[PDB]
Ligand binder design. Structure first.
Ligand SMILES: [Mg+2]
Lengths: 61, 339, 619
């Protein structure tokens, strides 16, 4: 209890003592990541159906 | 006096946190993403139904080859499937009927599972005698196994209803590190790409970011009004999403240390069971207790599509590493592969 | 199809739990059962080498207990203290205690050779049989075999079809008595039928039900001198007792043919009758109707006491009403408000032995039919014992006919033993009487309905069926047990050999948390399947396949009992509003599946309700 309320305060001190970036910068870095990897994502950028296991691919290992 | 003087300090600290967070909130992700094209209508269809489980499915996890996956079920079994052909690679009947979760090791040599037995149980998939057998029962949790994930063949993280998470050395069978801090049942964990950190979501309605190597909570995320049932890292490891009983998912950025977006809809009243991003991060797929899985534009918050196939809860989902396929597990007893 | 088929070994899954719930899987409860003993000795004599000599010695001590005379026992006394005994005392962990040995040598060394001489060994043999050995027995298939037999026992449902009726042998009150043979075993038996309509017509429903209950209290212990019951059952229109078989007619009819008997002859009838009474009194039953017509004769001329309809349990309450036949009732019986115990029978016996010698009851002068006179003489008149009677006989008859219970032979604290040690019986070895070894004096030779059965009347007989366990086990023991045991051993090895060809499906019940498994049939279209019950679900399969379907404990709103047609079933009410109905192959099996299912769904619904990922939510 008095142990476990000093444990909280010590932990909160850890959480306060980080430093942070603007949400504007954060959002931009995510948006930039998606655009960099848009062509690699088959759910956005479909690949040819003969290379898709679940469409038309016949040969496998 | 001391319980007062510390609880008075607890708020002034909690304030500093709200205020520092507010200091960063100079714009919103939806403002930043406002100018980019929508993804348009994402219409995926069922390309496989996996049959074999005789009851509810609770959990599923793709192998890193994007081909096999494990499923954990109320029928007391794990099933390892070849999603390309529909064949069962293995059917593993368990010692305890009450499994809730299952994991496939990155190597492919091992799977893990457990539940109300309170024991994460490791199965060796390629023995010297060509059989499937238990290589290890990891005891130590005093509550149910809710979720687990391998780092490598000899290390696994577990989340429990005892409110702790833990990292194990499989060979010695001991908790290397315990992650205490949650004040309610932990329900999911997800590992960051580099296995340096991980996040957990609990029934205290918070998510916590842990340092695996050190064994401590670095950041704590709130906003949700109800249990967090599921969690997931965005592919670059700077953010994660959560699924809650409050009918919302949320995006949380590590370095801003706050919520960036909510994904919800007045017409969606029920809770989210599972979550995962597409490979690029652009789509957030979430499974619901209304039998569907919704596909969200993670950057714009729009709803892009729906996977509507199951006849009961979607209870788990995964996207493959090659990003070709989505798997959904359901209380209807079938898995389905979509794309 | 008329013979016994035992259920398959898988019945053990359900029978062990059934027996365990009743604390009947103990060395004491099984060893003391006949079929339990035969199976346990088989295990010990043939499959556990370290227990053989114990059982061998046990069985040698039993032969000794049964030896008739002191000269024989002196022989075996030493004969025994030689062969096995030297193996036993030189075998480690097997020495008998010195306490036990000393005790035995102290008698033996003083030439004292009672039947119980070797008893201290019995106790220690039992001490060493009841631990490891017994636990190994339980693990063994000989216990599987006990469960198989036990299940047959507890599922006996008799009908006239199960008996081959041969001939009439006595028009009685509410119906007739037949001589018959049980088809199962071939055991010879009497069938007593009582017509349900006649019972209703003469208001004779209490008499039949009292006969049922009394036979029940008296039919244990394997009494040679009482007509006992093995089974009780009933058809829509009949009540049936299956009793010991007595072809020889009653003593009243034989007295009629033979005239009066001498002392030597009356003595023999008396001895046997007395032991019969000893049997009842010790089980706290008072017969109340002793007279020659209730004494039957077997084919050799040995006798048994017969109609138990009028007898009475006196363990808790003592009776007081006038009940019996009028020349034969005790003063205390005739007196209206006066209570009584076994006292009644010993006086009855006086009157009956008097009748055998003289032709009439002592309180019935010159063929009188005033039952009020006869009763009065009983209460007031000194019995005029004739001159020709021996002093010994007078002693006995004055004893038995003593109007005061506190003065009467057999009523002074030691019961039958007081009568037995009368000087009339001076010549008899009463062990020999018990073993039926004295020669009988007489060898028998060669020879309306306008009334309705209502719903209410049948409710008086719902708890009428009965099976006296030790009777059935002895019946089976002495007929078909050995040959059906070997015969099903034959089948089991073949079924195992046929499953070997298949590449046996390693039992699906092992390695998991299966609670119980067995056959039941679902739904006419009764589909017999094999079921496995798990803490959170119930699966079933047909043959040659793993289970492809189930019911979860979450769905099961309740497990209740219900009658479909006339066979009984389990009704599960299921979440969506669906019936699921199960039928079991035996009463035992119905009782466990009902219980275990109930327990499993009550536990499962408690657990799930506190797991946030398994429980149902606001939809
Ligand atoms: Mg009286």
């Amino acid at each position: 209890s008095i142990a476990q309320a000093r444990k909280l305060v010590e932990q909160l001190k850890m959480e306060a003592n980080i430093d942070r970036i603007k949400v504007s910068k954060a959002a931009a870095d995510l948006m930039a990541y998606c655009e960099a990897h848009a062509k690699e994502d088959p759910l956005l950028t479909p690949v040819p159906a003969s290379e898709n296991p679940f469409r038309e691919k016949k040969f496998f290992c | 006096s001391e319980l007062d003087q510390l609880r008075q300090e607890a708020e002034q600290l909690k304030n500093q946190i709200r205020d520092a967070r507010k200091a960063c909130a100079d714009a919103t992700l939806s403002q930043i993403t406002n100018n980019i094209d929508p993804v348009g209508r994402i219409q995926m269809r069922t390309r496989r139904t996996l049959r074999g489980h005789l009851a509810k499915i609770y959990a599923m996890h793709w192998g890193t080859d994007s081909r096999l996956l494990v499923s954990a079920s109320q029928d007391g079994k794990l099933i390892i499937w070849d999603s390309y052909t529909t064949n069962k690679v293995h059917a593993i009947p368990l010692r305890s009927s009450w499994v809730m979760t299952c994991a496939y090791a990155p190597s492919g040599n091992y799977v893990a599972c457990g539940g109300l037995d309170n024991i994460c149980s490791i199965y060796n998939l390629k023995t010297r005698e060509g059989n499937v057998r238990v290589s290890r029962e990891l005891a130590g949790h005093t509550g149910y196994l809710s979720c687990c994930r391998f780092l490598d063949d000899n290390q696994i993280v577990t989340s429990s209803g005892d409110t702790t998470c833990a990292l194990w050395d499989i060979e010695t069978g001991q908790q290397t590190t315990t992650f205490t801090g949650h004040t309610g049942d932990v329900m999911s964990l997800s590992l960051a790409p580099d296995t340096r950190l991980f996040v957990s979501g609990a029934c205290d309605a918070s998510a916590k970011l842990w340092d695996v190597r050190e064994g401590m909570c670095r950041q704590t995320f709130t906003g949700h009004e109800s249990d967090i049932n599921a969690i997931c890292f965005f592919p670059n490891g700077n953010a994660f999403a959560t699924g809650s009983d409050d009918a919302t998912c949320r995006l949380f950025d590590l370095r801003a240390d706050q919520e960036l977006m909510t994904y919800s809809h007045d017409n969606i009243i029920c809770g989210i069971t599972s979550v995962s991003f597409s490979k690029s991060g652009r789509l957030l797929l979430a499974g619901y207790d209304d039998f569907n899985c919704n596909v969200w534009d993670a950057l714009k918050a729009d709803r892009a599509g729906v996977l509507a196939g199951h006849d009961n809860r979607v209870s788990c989902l995964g996207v493959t590493d090659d990003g070709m396929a989505v798997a959904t597990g359901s209380w209807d007893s079938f898995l389905k592969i979509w794309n | 199809s008329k013979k016994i088929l035992l259920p398959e070994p898988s019945i053990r899954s359900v029978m062990q739990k059934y027996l365990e719930d009743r604390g009947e899987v103990t060395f004491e409860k099984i060893f003391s059962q006949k079929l339990g003993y035969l199976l346990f000795r088989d295990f010990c004599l043939n499959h556990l080498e370290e227990a053989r000599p114990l059982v061998e010695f046990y069985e040698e001590i039993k032969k000794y207990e049964k030896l008739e005379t002191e000269e024989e026992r002196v022989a075996r006394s030493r004969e025994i203290f030689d062969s096995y005994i030297m193996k036993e005392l030189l075998a480690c962990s097997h020495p008998f205690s010195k306490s036990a040995t000393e005790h035995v040598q102290g008698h033996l060394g003083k030439k004292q050779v009672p039947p119980d001489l070797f008893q201290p060994y019995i106790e220690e043999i039992c001490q060493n049989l009841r631990g490891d050995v017994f636990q190994k027995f339980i693990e063994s298939d000989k216990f599987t075999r006990f469960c198989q037999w036990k299940n047959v026992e507890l599922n006996i449902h008799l009908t006239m079809n199960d008996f081959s009726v041969h001939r009439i042998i006595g028009r009685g009150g509410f119906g007739e008595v037949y001589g018959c043979r049980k088809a199962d075993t071939g055991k010879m038996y009497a069938m007593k039928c009582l017509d349900k309509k006649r019972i209703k017509m003469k208001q004779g429903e209490t008499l039949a039900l009292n006969e049922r209950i009394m036979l029940s209290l008296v039919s244990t212990g394997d009494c040679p001198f009482i007509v006992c019951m093995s089974y009780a059952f009933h058809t829509p229109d009949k009540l049936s007792f299956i009793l010991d078989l007595m072809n020889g007619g009653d003593l009243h009819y034989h007295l009629s043919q033979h005239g009066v008997f001498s002392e030597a002859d009356m003595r023999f009838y008396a001895a046997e009758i007395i032991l019969g009474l000893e049997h009842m009194h010790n089980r706290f039953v008072v017969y109340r109707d002793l007279k020659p017509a209730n004494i039957l004769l077997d084919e050799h001329g040995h006798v048994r006491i017969s109609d138990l309809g009028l007898a009475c349990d006196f363990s808790k309450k003592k009776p007081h009403a006038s009940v019996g036949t009028h020349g034969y009732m005790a003063p205390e019986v005739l007196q209206k408000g006066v209570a009584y115990d076994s006292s009644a029978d010993w006086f009855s016996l006086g009157c009956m032995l008097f009748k055998l010698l003289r032709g009439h009851s002592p309180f019935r002068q010159h063929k009188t039919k005033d039952k009020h006179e006869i009763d009065r003489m009983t209460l007031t008149m000194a019995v005029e014992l004739p001159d020709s009677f021996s002093p010994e006989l007078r002693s006995l008859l004055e004893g038995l006919l003593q109007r005061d219970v506190n003065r009467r032979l057999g009523c002074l604290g030691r019961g039958a033993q007081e009568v037995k040690e009368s000087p009339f019986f001076r010549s008899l070895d009463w062990q020999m009487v018990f073993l039926q070894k004295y020669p009988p004096p007489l060898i028998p030779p060669r020879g309306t309905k306008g009334i309705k059965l209502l719903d209410s009347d049948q409710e008086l007989y719902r708890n009428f069926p009965l099976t006296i366990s030790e009777r059935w086990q002895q019946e089976v023991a002495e007929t078909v047990f050995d040959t059906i045991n070997a015969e099903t051993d034959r089948l089991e090895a073949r079924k195992k050999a046929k499953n070997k060809q298949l590449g046996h499906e390693e039992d699906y019940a092992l390695g998991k948390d299966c609670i119980m498994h067995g056959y039941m049939s679902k739904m006419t279209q009764w589909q017999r399947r094999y079921f496995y019950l798990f803490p959170n679900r119930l699966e079933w399969r047909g043959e040659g396949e793993a289970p492809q379907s189930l019911l979860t404990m979450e769905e099961i709103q309740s497990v209740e009992e219900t009658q479909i047609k006339e066979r009984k079933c389990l009704l599960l009410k299921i979440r969506g509003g669906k019936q699921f109905i199960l039928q079991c192959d035996s009463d035992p099996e119905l009782v466990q599946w009902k219980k275990e299912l109930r327990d499993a769904y009550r536990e499962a619904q408690q657990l799930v309700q506190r797991v946030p990922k398994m429980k149902n939510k606001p939809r």
